[PDB]
Amino acid sequence: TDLIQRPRRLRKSPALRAMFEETTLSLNDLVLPIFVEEEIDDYKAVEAMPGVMRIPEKHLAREIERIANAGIRSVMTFGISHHTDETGSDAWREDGLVARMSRICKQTVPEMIVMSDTCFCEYTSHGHCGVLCEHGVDNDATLENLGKQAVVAAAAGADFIAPSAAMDGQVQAIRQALDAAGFKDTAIMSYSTKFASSFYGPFREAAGSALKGDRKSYQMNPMNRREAIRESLLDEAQGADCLMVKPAGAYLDIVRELRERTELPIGAYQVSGEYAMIKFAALAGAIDEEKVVLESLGSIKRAGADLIFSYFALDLAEKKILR
Amino acid sequence: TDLIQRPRRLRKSPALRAMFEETTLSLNDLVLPIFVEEEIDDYKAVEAMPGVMRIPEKHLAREIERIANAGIRSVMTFGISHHTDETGSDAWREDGLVARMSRICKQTVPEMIVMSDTCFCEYTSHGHCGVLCEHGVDNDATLENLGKQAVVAAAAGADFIAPSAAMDGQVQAIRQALDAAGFKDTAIMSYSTKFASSFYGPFREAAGSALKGDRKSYQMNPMNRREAIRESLLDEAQGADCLMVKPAGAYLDIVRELRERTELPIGAYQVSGEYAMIKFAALAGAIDEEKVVLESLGSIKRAGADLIFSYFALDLAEKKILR
Amino acid sequence: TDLIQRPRRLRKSPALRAMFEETTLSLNDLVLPIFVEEEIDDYKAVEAMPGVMRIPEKHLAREIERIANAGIRSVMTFGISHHTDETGSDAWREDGLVARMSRICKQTVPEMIVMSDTCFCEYTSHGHCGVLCEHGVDNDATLENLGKQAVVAAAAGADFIAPSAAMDGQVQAIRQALDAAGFKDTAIMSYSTKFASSFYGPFREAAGSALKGDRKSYQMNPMNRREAIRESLLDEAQGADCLMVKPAGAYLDIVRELRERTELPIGAYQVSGEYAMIKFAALAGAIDEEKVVLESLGSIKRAGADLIFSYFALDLAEKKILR
Amino acid sequence: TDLIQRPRRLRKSPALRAMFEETTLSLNDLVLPIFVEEEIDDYKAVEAMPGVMRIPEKHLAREIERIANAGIRSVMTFGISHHTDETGSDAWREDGLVARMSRICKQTVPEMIVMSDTCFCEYTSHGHCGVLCEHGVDNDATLENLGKQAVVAAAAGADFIAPSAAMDGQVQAIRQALDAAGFKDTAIMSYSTKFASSFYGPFREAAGSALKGDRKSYQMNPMNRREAIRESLLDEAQGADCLMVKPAGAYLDIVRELRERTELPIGAYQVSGEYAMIKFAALAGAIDEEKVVLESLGSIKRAGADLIFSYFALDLAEKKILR
Amino acid sequence: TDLIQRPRRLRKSPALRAMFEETTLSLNDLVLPIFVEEEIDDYKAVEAMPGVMRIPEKHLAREIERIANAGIRSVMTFGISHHTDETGSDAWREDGLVARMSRICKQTVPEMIVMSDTCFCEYTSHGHCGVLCEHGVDNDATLENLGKQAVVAAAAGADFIAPSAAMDGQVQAIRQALDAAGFKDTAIMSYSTKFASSFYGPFREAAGSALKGDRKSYQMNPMNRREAIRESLLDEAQGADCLMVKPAGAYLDIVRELRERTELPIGAYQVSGEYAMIKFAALAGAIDEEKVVLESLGSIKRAGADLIFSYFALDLAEKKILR
Numbered sequence A, B, C, D, E: 001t002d003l004i005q006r007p008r009r010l011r012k013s014p015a016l017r018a019m020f021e022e023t024t025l026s027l028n029d030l031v032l033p034i035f036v037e038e039e040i041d042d043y044k045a046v047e048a049m050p051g052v053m054r055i056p057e058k059h060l061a062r063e064i065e066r067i068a069n070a071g072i073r074s075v076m077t078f079g080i081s082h083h084t085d086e087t088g089s090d091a092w093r094e095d096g097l098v099a100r101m102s103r104i105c106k107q108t109v110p111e112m113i114v115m116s117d118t119c120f121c122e123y124t125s126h127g128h129c130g131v132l133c134e135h136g137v138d139n140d141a142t143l144e145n146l147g148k149q150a151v152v153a154a155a156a157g158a159d160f161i162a163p164s165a166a167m168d169g170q171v172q173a174i175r176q177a178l179d180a181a182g183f184k185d186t187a188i189m190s191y192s193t194k195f196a197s198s199f200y201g202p203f204r205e206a207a208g209s210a211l212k213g214d215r216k217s218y219q220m221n222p223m224n225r226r227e228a229i230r231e232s233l234l235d236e237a238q239g240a241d242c243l244m245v246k247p248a249g250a251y252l253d254i255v256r257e258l259r260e261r262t263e264l265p266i267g268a269y270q271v272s273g274e275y276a277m278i279k280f281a282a283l284a285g286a287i288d289e290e291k292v293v294l295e296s297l298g299s300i301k302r303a304g305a306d307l308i309f310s311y312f313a314l315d316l317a318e319k320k321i322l323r
């Protein structure tokens, strides 16, 4: 055949493939989410997330050293609360669980980058990401509280405050609150573009949220690409340090579009349902787990993410699969 | 002060800097240029390129194993000839030096990616990159010969033919010649955008070109960004597999512009004068050599290059500075 | 060969090359940086910058006339201080060295465009670009001082205030301070995009900074192109008159990208390490100095810079190489 | 007033204006058009172009040396014929005027870049830019002749063939003709975008065209910007070396648009009527001639032209106004 | 010849040319500038602008009816003052000339769109566009006065206030002043991009400005395309209703660039020197006046202007050349 162009010329050997490979994945790309339960003694398996456990508070300092020693740079803290109430007020108590997770991690590994998931769905009786009203989840009452939580997390050592509540104006509320309290240098990792996704099931189990109902009056419609971009760019305008697309794996179009619309860094969250889908299919012999995980994570990087939140991170680090 | 945006938030610690670092440099990014002299016994120091030596042919198989064992993926071959003539005909002889460099490297390390610098300036009495005429360097007579050289290099094992002659239509001539001889899978690494630069001095010494005069009737004016882009895009149209900007270090604007005008891979050559400038200033105590080299190479990557030709490559690999 | 396109047609003669040359370099493109030491009598050679000297204050008026008579349009002032302290307060004293450099230059050559490097690394005991804290270099305490320095430099005659401290919000702080003091017409040449580069070594020696440590918590990571652009565009939003990329020579991708993202003028600083690399390699015979310098400077112009800060400037002017 | 942005800051002095001036004009930017009449003895004033003269053939060698000695790089040749006929056949005679103008210029100043206006309006009885038909100016019969003329001009020494006939497909016809005759290196300066302009009056007088009628069936409508761009891009596709917008002075929108649609070089012709408008208004005291000319030429450069054809060129060079 | 594309197909007849003509010129495109001298009896010829006269105030009401009856939609008023002073204060007097020109025009032809040139160069002893200082033309003192003038022009009937002073922040000053005085509906036709051009000579004579010196510390450098665009976009940000490029004829690149950077309307001023160049060359027989004028004006329209200020306007209207 007369073909001057032959893309196969660069695919002949593993060496040629490695030379020309456009996208690289390292431990510098990963953030490890961690589940911490107060007032328990034994690690608790999350059945819907095979291989993931709730870490007892009493063991946290141990676990964070281990995470640190594998070479992981950063964790995102999630609390399982034994102190829920109508407004999630334990989350703005100086020594409530949110504060203690951050304080423990930072005291034990001072160079660990600590990001504190900042919401109320894990602290509220009713299970919603904020203050419940006759009218539904009250945006502006929730904002005030997000500010108060951010202040105590920052006071306790958190490097990033990470508002996962999907409230309008939450970046700006948290920014004003950090600054007025003297935490000008504490960063905001906004969950800027966060969809009302069906991929979050296993996280219900891991983090114990009490919600009967849905988050569709605050979290945005999966199908809305224009609105997705807009949601993120609003957060840039309010001063966030890092944007984020969540979930990630079924949203790589969104990642890429955002990448071309901002210069800020972008995170992408490989959520619990994505984790569960890989684990369960691998348990069943249907895929090779390690190859799928690397491909899934690589894809998230290819699409434009600077940082990826992954539950696989510690395992990949302890096995030296990434460095 | 009232500043909501504080870029310094992400620069606080080495860990934060590493997380947010936009550009990564690995051994998969490097090609090692090598100087091979036929019919000598001892390694010959290049004074103008401290730390670089001409490798005797008789020692090549040894050197290529060593290069391979450091983890280097690819080399670019340059010959010092003891058989020069009016047309550089040793370079299209089946068993001339060009062919033997390629044959030795590939026989000794079959997975080594071998790229053969493809010209006549090292093989001609007069020292020009081709067939000398009354009218100057004859473009089309030179093209015919480039084809013949490409065929013998490919026959001998070269993965890439790399025309450094800066002749109009050289990609297409070499492509037609490889294909008509049955080397459809042999690739073309064009020196697509190659400037008539004053940064090539030390290479005169290393490769022993006999030229008294200049290359300005073929190599393009350093100052011509529009023409630079055009020169590369012509090569894409003729079917090259990889484009290249040379020199690189004072041409990162060019790299970046090209990056946004093509999807092909792009190489960038960190030439002998750049090497010499780093080495001599470091010898004099004026800079830290290792920090400068990493920054120089990183910059070339940042600007958009997929591959970088660097004389530092083996040292960085043997020292485990890159992997 | 059948080639309708032959780029070589326009490269045949020097005359054709000159007609089609896309980028021109003149003295209107150069700013000369100058080192002035207070309370000394003899010129002091900077060993790491061959051919550069510290000029005694007592000789400044002489040197500035000479610079002026060569046709140089503008200088950037750097002081070597015999009055350092914890905060660099000599730099906001009405008659401190910063003020006197500017006053002398302007009184002696009223039409000389004077730009005053505006920082504290040359005036502080500890050697940092500002107010040292438990927490590191305090951004906002540093800003206040930058304002006070800008006011005295402007009062003394400086045409441009040039903040090289890499503090967040420094353009706006200096702007508000100049305006509130009645210096509305004094311009800001921001060192907008200034990288934590290893190319600044020889400047340690020339300007005598006391720093043991690094500037990486304020100066930005070399590898971060997105952040580089953003850093500059923030400065445009705060009202700077001119932006700047520093270093320049390994950052021409950055220059070009910025060029397409703003209409403001852009400067580019050919820093001490670039100077040293050219000088040392030329001393060693490895390159032709004059050809390299012209090519380096031309490249900076090609990439999009309106102004270039170069230590070669006076020599090129006195020799009539540029006009 | 509270204005942070003050563009006037950079306009304070001539020195500041020169530093920030975006566009520069040199002799490397100019091509001098010249009128040569065969078979006359005295220089003949063109009344409609004050200060311009027809140069007798017998004096050409003298005039071209003078032009060369002023520092002019290039001329465009126009003949006044004493041998007109139905087809303009003197223009493809080996020793016809077109050939002799080129031969004389190149023999006398071998480094002079000679461009030969390539048409038939100056050689035809009827005065049209080609072969007259019942149907009007026959495009394809004209093309054949353009080829034959190009061959004799190239044989005689012309560096550029410059088809001013505005015939469809003229670049390609001339290219094929130069190549088949062995003039592969002879360049094409196409009058790519040439409008049916009322600014060409004084050229009727200078070049003595016999036309009673108009050129509107070949030269394009002044008002058609889309078609203007398209006309030029067709010429790029046929292989021209340089494009051109003519006239220039009332067509700077066209220049700029084209500049952003191609990487080729662009010329712009400051035509006879523009020349006459400046000269007559200056004669009348209404403008300062030198200031207007510099501004007019600068504007043409600003708009994006690499080369400008100007009747003022020799005067500006002899007076050292440009260098 | 084998050419499928033949642009000449659409140029065969005048009918085909008219069908495909991309750009149309009507009286709806023209604004007529008018010179009015107070306290004179006879019309006064402007020698440098053949065919233009100063209109005595006493005859204005007559002239404006005539202008109106030719179909002209709009005039721009320029006064010749018999009451100059250090600050141009007659221009903010309730019944000063600026006010009376506007009042007369609007009272006599209520539907005439009146635009009032808004400056001080015609009202000042020293002849500058504002308040003279030790430091030169004081920007902010001038702004205050521009506000006061705008208020009296608006009070007197002006539809547009048109600040030709080239002062920083003049749109915003005039906007705030109109609004605070209750003239919210009075429009601003900013002379947004106004160059320090040598094409304004004949206007010195027509409008009698006393300036010995230049306007280069306020009017922008002809050569600065980037700054030109920026100057206009600042004016859009301050709320102007219409932007303007002046001069126009040598600035069509600027018009077109601006056209693609804003949605506002754009005016373009065909200044006195352009007028004089056409008139003097036509007087001399060198061009056909009517054909040149139509082409010049058409070109300004082609380049993107919505409105064109032309001294030819009334003549073209009275002759029914445009409608």
Ligand SMILES: NCc1[nH]cc(CCC(=O)O)c1CC(=O)O
Pocket: A117, A119, A121, A129, A164, A165, A199, A200, A201, A202, A203, A215, A270, A271, A272, A273
């Ligand atoms: N604020 C809630 C929160 N923060 C993190 C996630 C899910 C993360 C995962 O599924 O791994 C959720 C749950 C939800 O929003 O419905």
Ligand SMILES: NCc1[nH]cc(CCC(=O)O)c1CC(=O)O
Pocket: B117, B119, B121, B129, B164, B165, B199, B200, B201, B202, B203, B215, B270, B271, B272, B273
């Ligand atoms: N075909 C010549 C060739 N191939 C490689 C280089 C220089 C590479 C270097 O300087 O490291 C040169 C020399 C030149 O082109 O003038």
Ligand SMILES: NCc1[nH]cc(CCC(=O)O)c1CC(=O)O
Pocket: C117, C119, C121, C129, C164, C165, C199, C200, C201, C202, C203, C215, C270, C271, C272, C273
């Ligand atoms: N404010 C510091 C300053 N201003 C100028 C430079 C270096 C200029 C050169 O290297 O020529 C430096 C040093 C540094 O930032 O580390």
Ligand SMILES: NCc1[nH]cc(CCC(=O)O)c1CC(=O)O
Pocket: D117, D119, D121, D129, D164, D165, D199, D200, D201, D202, D203, D215, D270, D271, D272, D273
């Ligand atoms: N082929 C004709 C030709 N070549 C140059 C010009 C005019 C150049 C000038 O007016 O200076 C003209 C005349 C026309 O096309 O009508």
Ligand SMILES: NCc1[nH]cc(CCC(=O)O)c1CC(=O)O
Pocket: E117, E119, E121, E129, E164, E165, E199, E200, E201, E202, E203, E215, E270, E271, E272, E273
């Ligand atoms: N404010 C001055 C003003 N307003 C109109 C013009 C010139 C208009 C013309 O030349 O037709 C000028 C003169 C100048 O700015 O120097």
Ligand SMILES: [Zn+2]
Pocket: A039, A082, A083
């Ligand atoms: Zn409890």
Ligand SMILES: [Zn+2]
Pocket: A119, A120, A121, A122, A128, A129, A164, A165
């Ligand atoms: Zn929640």
Ligand SMILES: [Zn+2]
Pocket: A166, A167, A168, A169, A192, A231, A234, A235
């Ligand atoms: Zn939101």
Ligand SMILES: [Zn+2]
Pocket: B039, B082, B083
């Ligand atoms: Zn031998």
Ligand SMILES: [Zn+2]
Pocket: B119, B120, B121, B122, B128, B129, B164, B165
């Ligand atoms: Zn060569």
Ligand SMILES: [Zn+2]
Pocket: B166, B167, B168, B169, B192, B231, B234, B235
């Ligand atoms: Zn090429």
Ligand SMILES: [Zn+2]
Pocket: C039, C082, C083
């Ligand atoms: Zn002292």
Ligand SMILES: [Zn+2]
Pocket: C119, C120, C121, C122, C128, C129, C164, C165
């Ligand atoms: Zn400093």
Ligand SMILES: [Zn+2]
Pocket: C166, C167, C168, C169, C192, C231, C234, C235
């Ligand atoms: Zn900054």
Ligand SMILES: [Zn+2]
Pocket: D039, D082, D083
């Ligand atoms: Zn004859």
Ligand SMILES: [Zn+2]
Pocket: D119, D120, D121, D122, D128, D129, D164, D165
């Ligand atoms: Zn013609």
